[PDB]
Design an enzyme around this catalytic site. Structure first.
Site, PDB file in Angstrom:
ATOM      1  N   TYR A   1       0.891  -1.179   0.000  1.00  0.00           N
ATOM      2  CA  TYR A   1       0.000   0.000   0.000  1.00  0.00           C
ATOM      3  C   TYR A   1       0.914   1.208   0.000  1.00  0.00           C
ATOM      4  CZ  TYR A   1      -4.291   2.551   1.529  1.00  0.00           C
ATOM      5  OH  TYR A   1      -5.353   3.370   1.579  1.00  0.00           O
TER       6      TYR A   1
ATOM      7  N   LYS B   1      -1.368  -1.242  -4.098  1.00  0.00           N
ATOM      8  CA  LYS B   1      -2.381  -0.198  -4.210  1.00  0.00           C
ATOM      9  C   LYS B   1      -1.571   1.112  -4.210  1.00  0.00           C
ATOM     10  CE  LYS B   1      -6.315   1.875  -1.661  1.00  0.00           C
ATOM     11  NZ  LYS B   1      -5.894   3.256  -1.302  1.00  0.00           N
TER      12      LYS B   1
HETATM   13  O1  LIG Z   1      -7.709   4.951  -1.758  1.00  0.00           O
HETATM   14  C1  LIG Z   1      -7.839   6.160  -1.656  1.00  0.00           C
HETATM   15  C2  LIG Z   1      -9.244   6.754  -1.727  1.00  0.00           C
HETATM   16  O2  LIG Z   1      -9.388   7.868  -0.845  1.00  0.00           O
HETATM   17  C3  LIG Z   1      -9.545   7.320  -3.093  1.00  0.00           C
HETATM   18  O3  LIG Z   1     -10.403   6.470  -3.814  1.00  0.00           O
HETATM   19 MG   LIG Z   2     -10.020   4.568   0.909  1.00  0.00          MG
END
Ligand SMILES: O=C[C@@H](O)CO
Ligand SMILES: [Mg+2]
Ligand SMILES: O=C[C@@H](O)CO
Ligand SMILES: O=C[C@@H](O)CO
Ligand SMILES: O=C[C@@H](O)CO
Ligand SMILES: [Mg+2]
Ligand SMILES: [Mg+2]
Ligand SMILES: [Mg+2]
Lengths: 298, 298, 298, 298
Positions: free
Chosen positions: A134, A163
């Site tokens: 992440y 992500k």
């Molecule tokens: O993952 C981050 C979120 O705030 C935006 O879709």
């Molecule tokens: Mg989020």
């Protein structure tokens, strides 16, 4: 490639007294599954992981995993600054039946590169589950660079995606070229709604973005159109996703906004949020409503 | 709306001895006009304004304006840190026959907001030409925020657009909503190739981006497809423009890269650049060549 | 070690039309020499180099050098973004009788480390004078790190010092340990008033700071006390220098503040500043006056 | 004014299994008290609060408070991202007999100014103890500006000081002028060793800095000399404090370096640190040893 497609960072629903709201969280989960998402991610940023204690996170993960009941792949966010706790939450997630975990870099101390690599290797060693990294440098103050991510993927075969939460086409492009160029099945998901279309066109895999909670159909349909070769239709959905992130400026943290949008778009859940988030005020709720109405989402 | 569409930031061609190369600059100009661009912008970042002296800039602007001979609109970049010089260069541009000027914020001192507004108002008062603002915060260290740009547009009716040079969908979106929401004919052009498509979809107007020099057809055809309503085709071109900015990582400044790409794509000009830029080495020229080959641009 | 001690970045005095005010600049120069400074630096940041044209800078340098008439060492700031101009202004400085040049890194493009090294080497090779580097990362957006400065000092024997303009004890310490550790006679001067004392205690050499213009005696006496071994007295002067930089918050750029302080401290020079700086308003002049009075400087 | 003078951020000593080492922590505490410190701060950054679980933090605080047995004032760091936990840990501290708490801003989300103010008000309203703010922007990514701190002090009379952990004279100066100007008894402590002397000369109150753990005598003697009016002697101690922070570059996090320095300066405690920190390697331990030797601290 694992955990591709549309995987929402599900909001955790709490009661007015700040307890896990099981009926509401379950109803949200079922709405998203019915909408055709490819997976569900609990205890992301928008799931309020950082405002929850470890025992609370365990209880929420177990509930969510058990409610999903293997209908779609389940990711649990297990990160933080306390690395011993990351391991504990990650092992708990594997014991409870999660399909993977999502781990941010420690975001208080920005540790040395040697410590950062070691940290991720230790976490990845602690479970047999797939691990998604992440990256959220706006909040962590330390970027997971494409080079670093490639090094991690080279080191542990269960570090299998990221992500990448950044408003940067260059970062998504380079993540894809560098990491996927070495590991073609490594998964690159963008963390912002307005980068889904570009992420697909760049050779990436999907999104974990907050609009998944209240308007999943937009991203699901975009992905479907793209996979069917109907680029024009995908671009139509994208025009909508380009506009949605205006809503997130209404507050910081904007976890309140997301839950108010779930309500407005037709699922009546308690919108309680944990401190130091706070309830959205009525004027801003109306502003959110007008945005959703203009985009034809409620 | 003025200065919409595709307006390349034209490279200035110099001889091996560092003089303006008139035949080569003219040939580049004629290639771009033949490719169907909507205008030409001389003495932008990629035109090397910041490595040229004032008298050199005047000579280049006169030459370019005269060569173009009104075939398409001409913008001259007249900014810097020396504000008296900005005024001189801008008046000179108007006297020489330019159609507009493009003015960055001063980029040594990051001046107070009051001073910054006053600067732009003075520059705008010094000419009757349209003025395009230039935002490039990665270089200037001071962002022209949508609010500020709106304030400038409210103050002077000849401040009529912006080249917003930033890898940020949010910034483009907000620029468009805030400024165009108050001034529907204010022009918003993105400064990076990989944001053209999104800029259009967001309600903006075009691009001033370096790939205009060596692959103008990609942007021209994207714009045409978008104006014809063939969104799928526009998306096809966008897939290319998404990839092109990798090349700019080959050096910093990357003005050398752009000239080498002009050569590789079929226009043999001297690629001399002014210091502190330097010649691109042969390995990186080959890398650039392989990039252009993979995207089918040479 | 060359150019040690207190060397003010002397303000350039202008008439209302923005031309060099020779009687006022000369009077300022004579005041500073009479105050016991170790040298004088013209066309630094506070000397408004970045708002002056190249011909103007050459006239100012010639005047200043000639007026000083070898009474103290003279440094001329010759930097900018136009590297050809740097070389021209540096060779002009040497021909005009300067004792050294002060060269900032280019501050539009933040050029690659290879280009940056090459730039400084070329500028150093263009003259047989000593060269002082100028680090001002708040304005340039690119730090000259102790490692990089060491590399430069290792490469060229006429690169002999730095004006390290940063509010960072760590940066000064590391500059001193890394560079002076390798080159014991390399000169480290801080660029801020409130770091002089610490700079001396760390093993560095002095200061080029704006309060040199209106209260040189404070820095000159601090340095004398330190050299005489009267640390308590030096600390007393330091307590004043610690407070002086409050005034620089009154405007940005604060070149106006400095000239207003010269007037308030007893030297009536014109306070005209070049755009995009602007005159300090009367309320802030009264605030500046109160501060100077509280510190016992007028 | 509360919690003035020298207040070390005491290291937490652990066994190899990552549990609190009571004999070693107690010995450290006794060494510091005997060295004449004005107070003790547990579970600051250097105390590893962000790598400990809430129950662990409570056990450590209880133990430390109890061992100190009111010999000097005791501060407990109770912050984090989980605001409900902040309140729990703060109330637990008060019940366990702490004299005050130290609360950083939430450092995952950088929450809106309204949320930030509300957070601090709620934490302050949860206890009847004095509350010290903790600013560490390098780690938090969100500065507690002097204006914001003033607003907090204006709002709650138990918000009575700050640990301002930043390598910035300007930040300390402005914190003191803005907040102490409005609240003369508000306590301003710097968080770095090399800013103690300046902090005192600026009108601030002391330091909470890591060298308190292994060389408390340096800061205690500096402060005593300053209070006794022997500024030269104070400046002598400062020269040592100016140099000490070079050791913190040996690793990141440098909680390992601090413990190794405690050992090297004569107190044999376990140097175990919690992940994602890791043991300092032998070459860097020898480097640390040489540094301490050169500064005459072991
Ligand atoms: O993952 C981050 C979120 O705030 C935006 O879709
Ligand atoms: Mg989020
Ligand atoms: O002209 C702007 C540069 O950033 C190239 O797109
Ligand atoms: O030299 C640096 C200026 O900002 C004034 O000290
Ligand atoms: O408080 C912060 C420490 O690490 C520095 O002494
Ligand atoms: Mg360009
Ligand atoms: Mg100055
Ligand atoms: Mg500490």
């Amino acid at each position: 490639a694992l955990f591709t497609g549309i995987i929402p960072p599900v909001s955790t629903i709490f009661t007015a007294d700040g307890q896990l709201d099981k009926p509401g969280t379950a109803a949200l989960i079922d709405d998203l599954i019915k909408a055709g998402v490819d997976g569900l991610f609990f205890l992301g940023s928008g799931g309020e992981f950082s405002q929850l204690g470890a025992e609370e996170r365990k209880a929420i993960a177990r509930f969510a995993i058990d409610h999903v009941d293997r209908r779609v792949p389940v990711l649990i966010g297990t990160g933080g600054t306390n690395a011993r706790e990351t391991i504990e939450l990650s092992q708990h997630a594997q014991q409870a039946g999660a399909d993977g975990i999502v781990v941010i870099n420690p975001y208080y101390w920005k540790v040395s590169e040697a410590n950062l690599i070691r940290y991720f290797e230790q976490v990845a060693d602690s479970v047999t589950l797939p691990v998604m990294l992440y990256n959220f440098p706006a909040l962590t103050g330390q970027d997971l660079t494409p080079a670093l991510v490639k090094t991690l993927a080279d080191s542990r075969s269960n570090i299998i995606g990221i992500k990448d939460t950044i408003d940067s086409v260059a970062h998504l492009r380079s993540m894809i070229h560098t990491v996927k160029g070495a590991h073609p099945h490594f998964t690159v998901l963008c963390g912002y709604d307005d980068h889904l279309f570009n992420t697909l066109l760049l050779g990436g895999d999907g999104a974990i973005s907050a609009s998944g909670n209240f308007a999943p159909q937009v991203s699901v349909n975009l992905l479907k159109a793209w996979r069917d070769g109907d680029v024009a239709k995908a671009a139509g959905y994208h025009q909508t996703l380009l506009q949605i992130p205006q809503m997130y400026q209404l507050d910081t943290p904007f976890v309140n906004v997301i839950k108010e949008a779930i309500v407005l778009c037709g699922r009546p859940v308690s919108t309680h949020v944990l401190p130091p988030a706070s309830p959205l005020d009525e004027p801003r709720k109306a502003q959110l409503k007008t945005l959703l109405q203009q985009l034809k989402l409620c």
